[PDB]
Amino acid sequence: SGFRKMAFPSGKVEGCMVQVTCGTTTLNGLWLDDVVYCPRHVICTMLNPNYEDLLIRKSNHNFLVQAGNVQLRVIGHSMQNCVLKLKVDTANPKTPKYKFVRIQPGQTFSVLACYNGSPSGVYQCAMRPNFTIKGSFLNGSCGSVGFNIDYDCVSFCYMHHMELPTGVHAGTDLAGNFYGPFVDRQTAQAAGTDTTITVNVLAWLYAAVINGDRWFLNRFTTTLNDFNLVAMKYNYEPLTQDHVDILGPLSAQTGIAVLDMCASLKELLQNGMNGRTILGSALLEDEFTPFDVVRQCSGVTFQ
Amino acid sequence: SGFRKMAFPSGKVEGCMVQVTCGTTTLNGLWLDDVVYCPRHVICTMLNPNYEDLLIRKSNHNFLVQAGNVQLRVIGHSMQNCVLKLKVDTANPKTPKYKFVRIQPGQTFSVLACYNGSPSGVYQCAMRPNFTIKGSFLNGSCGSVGFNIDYDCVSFCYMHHMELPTGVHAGTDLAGNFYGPFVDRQTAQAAGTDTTITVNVLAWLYAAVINGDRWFLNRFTTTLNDFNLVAMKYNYEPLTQDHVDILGPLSAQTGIAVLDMCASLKELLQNGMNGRTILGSALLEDEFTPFDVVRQCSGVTFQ
Ligand SMILES: *[C@H](O)[C@H](C[C@@H]1CCNC1=O)NC(=O)[C@H](CC(C)(C)C)NC(=O)[C@@](C)(NC(=O)OCc1ccccc1)C(C)C
Numbered sequence: 307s308g309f310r311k312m313a314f315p316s317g318k319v320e321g322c323m324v325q326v327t328c329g330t331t332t333l334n335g336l337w338l339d340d341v342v343y344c345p346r347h348v349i350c351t352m353l354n355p356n357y358e359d360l361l362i363r364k365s366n367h368n369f370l371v372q373a374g375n376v377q378l379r380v381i382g383h384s385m386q387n388c389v390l391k392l393k394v395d396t397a398n399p400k401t402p403k404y405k406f407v408r409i410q411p412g413q414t415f416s417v418l419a420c421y422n423g424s425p426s427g428v429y430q431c432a433m434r435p436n437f438t439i440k441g442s443f444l445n446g447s448c449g450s451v452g453f454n455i456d457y458d459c460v461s462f463c464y465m466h467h468m469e470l471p472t473g474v475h476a477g478t479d480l481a482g483n484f485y486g487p488f489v490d491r492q493t494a495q496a497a498g499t500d501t502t503i504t505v506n507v508l509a510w511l512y513a514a515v516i517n518g519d520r521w522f523l524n525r526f527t528t529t530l531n532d533f534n535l536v537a538m539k540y541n542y543e544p545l546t547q548d549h550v551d552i553l554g555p556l557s558a559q560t561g562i563a564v565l566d567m568c569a570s571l572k573e574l575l576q577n578g579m580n581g582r583t584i585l586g587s588a589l590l591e592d593e594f595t596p597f598d599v600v601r602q603c604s605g606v607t608f609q
Numbered sequence: 610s611g612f613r614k615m616a617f618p619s620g621k622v623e624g625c626m627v628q629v630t631c632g633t634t635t636l637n638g639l640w641l642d643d644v645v646y647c648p649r650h651v652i653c654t655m656l657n658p659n660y661e662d663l664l665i666r667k668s669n670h671n672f673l674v675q676a677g678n679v680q681l682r683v684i685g686h687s688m689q690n691c692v693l694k695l696k697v698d699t700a701n702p703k704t705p706k707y708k709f710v711r712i713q714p715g716q717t718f719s720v721l722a723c724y725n726g727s728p729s730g731v732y733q734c735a736m737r738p739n740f741t742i743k744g745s746f747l748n749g750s751c752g753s754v755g756f757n758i759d760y761d762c763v764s765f766c767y768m769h770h771m772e773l774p775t776g777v778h779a780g781t782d783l784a785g786n787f788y789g790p791f792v793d794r795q796t797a798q799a800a801g802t803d804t805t806i807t808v809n810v811l812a813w814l815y816a817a818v819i820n821g822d823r824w825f826l827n828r829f830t831t832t833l834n835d836f837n838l839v840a841m842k843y844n845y846e847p848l849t850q851d852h853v854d855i856l857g858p859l860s861a862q863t864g865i866a867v868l869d870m871c872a873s874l875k876e877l878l879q880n881g882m883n884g885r886t887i888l889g890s891a892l893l894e895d896e897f898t899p900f901d902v903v904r905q906c907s908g909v910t911f912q
């Protein structure tokens with residue numbers, strides 16, 4: 307038993323991390339097949355760039371691409387939105403089955419923080435409703451990727467770009483399109499009002515239940531509206547009937563009805579946690595999707 | 610910026626995970642060079658085993674050892690304490706530079722949870738003072754390892770064995786010796802009274818400081834004794850003058866004296882956190898060593 311913030315095993319992505327330098331700018335890139343995806347501000351030197359005039363003045367030989375102790379030779383470059391696909395002369399032998407995928411807020415993905423093309427650490431994140439992530443990134447970590455793994459296949463969904471002034475982060479998917487109203491430019495931009503992910507907090511409460519944490523339950527129940535009218539008050543995000551659908555097998559395995567656990571989340575929101583924790587946490591924790599909980603509380607592996 | 614519970618990148622260990630079956634018992638093993646280290650209860654079928662009479666009745670051919678889609682042939686077996694070194698005829702090509710190391714309580718290590726030899730997830734842990742870890746393990750996860758990584762070298766320090774009745778876990782180092790008063794046997798055993806790791810909580814407070822969380826600081830200071838006499842009250846573990854030494858570069862980079870942050874931790878312990886968080890947490894968090902914080906708040910990589 308037990309319940310941790312678990313990342314995906316990071317080995318498949320490590321073999322795809324490379325160093326990309328251009329001028330006095332160095333960041334991380336993603337080497338899949340014979341293409342090295344990196345952020346596009348690497349061609350910069352950031353207040354108000356026209357990226358189309360910057361890329362047209364570049365040539366192949368401006369991009370230093372370091373795959374460890376091996377320089378990679380670029381043979382063509384193109385900008386798809388806010389990413390650079392530099393296609394090179396070696397296809398990466400550790401390329402794995404993969405997919406580029408665009409996630410929805412609430413969904414969670416492992417992040418492989420990188421510097422100079424060397425993985426530094428791995429941690430789990432969630433796409434906040436306001437299209438930010440709260441991770442750990444220093445100068446030199448751009449081009450780090452975020453990703454889930456489904457059996458043997460690697461769904462890249464995130465590439466780090468920039469830190470907003472509240473210490474949150476913003477980045478694209480791998481087709482190059484920013485999540486949210488964020489632009490790769492040193493102009494005032496701000497995350498937006500964030501909300502809590504109601505469907506993940508209930509999952510997590512189910513994750514407590516499977517693990518002997520039952521202090522926050524009750525006899526009570528209520529209806530989806532009556533609770534969503536309290537979800538709004540405490541800045542949680544609306545619960546749909548389609549959310550309840552996805553919280554079924556959890557409610558199956560534990561025999562606690564979704565509307566009852568909502569009623570229990572009510573209780574908790576309106577009363578706080580009065581000097582206790584759930585799952586080692588004194589806060590309500592919305593970065594565990596329903597599919598996370600059943601991965602972890604039931605042990606699916608990957609190979 | 611930002612501050613997450615970051616695991617080590619898990620790629621080096623993945624290439625060392627194998628499946629070991631014996632009878633109707635299957636668990637994980639660690640394939641380094643031509644030796645497959647696994648727990649020794651795999652020879653079991655658990656109330657009161659003499660493991661020396663169990664191993665002597667075994668033969669090489671009883672150990673099914675599955676390295677994915679390749680059966681590995683054991684050619685000799687030996688029990689070093691609570692582990693089985695089954696030496697096999699193939700030396701693992703993904704063996705990396707490694708060390709077997711025995712950690713001290715307070716120290717933290719990445720854990721690569723495995724089932725059927727397939728890594729399931731990776732998370733960071735700390736060796737609790739009572740020689741337990743709080744991780745995430747289901748039936749079939751024994752022989753998972755815990756580990757730090759120093760440049761290119763992999764210090765294995767943990768192998769999962771058993772869950773205690775409070776949902777905590779206990780396991781050995783890789784020489785086979787249990788951390789603490791725990792035995793690989795289905796007899797009543799209990800973790801012991803746990804304490805909080807005072808030197809890690811101050812590190813974490815320093816980790817808040819570097820990141821714009823200054824609400825818990827103050828002008829005050831006090832002496833090491835006067836605070837350790839409160840550390841006892843709130844079940845924290847004694848702070849030494851050698852701990853203060855290790856909390857130096859943090860106190861260097863931020864210009865906050867160690868005795869002042871102690872004074873600030875006092876304040877917090879005696880008053881609680883009155884409706885705020887530090888680093889996204891409403892609790893005081895002792896699973897970040899001083900060397901963690903500077904790894905993360907300064908970006909050391911690995912290759
Ligand atoms: C690439 O490694 C680097 C990584 C960030 C540095 C620290 N954390 C990161 O994720 N990316 C940048 O340096 C990025 C560059 C672009 C602006 C995207 C081209 N810069 C930033 O993240 C900064 C400059 N912030 C902003 O870009 O703008 C938001 C803003 C600017 C001015 C006033 C208000 C808001 C810094 C926060 C580093």
Ligand SMILES: *[C@H](O)[C@H](C[C@@H]1CCNC1=O)NC(=O)[C@H](CC(C)(C)C)NC(=O)[C@@](C)(NC(=O)OCc1ccccc1)C(C)C
Pocket residue numbers: 307636650653655746747748749750751752769770771772773774778792793794795796797798799
């Ligand atoms: C190997 O995968 C397996 C992994 C544990 C199962 C769930 N989490 C784990 O880490 N290990 C065991 O099944 C282990 C076997 C030995 C006892 C070590 C040989 N068994 C346990 O963990 C159990 C049986 N607990 C105990 O071993 O004993 C403590 C105890 C027993 C009885 C009364 C009080 C305390 C279970 C908790 C699974």
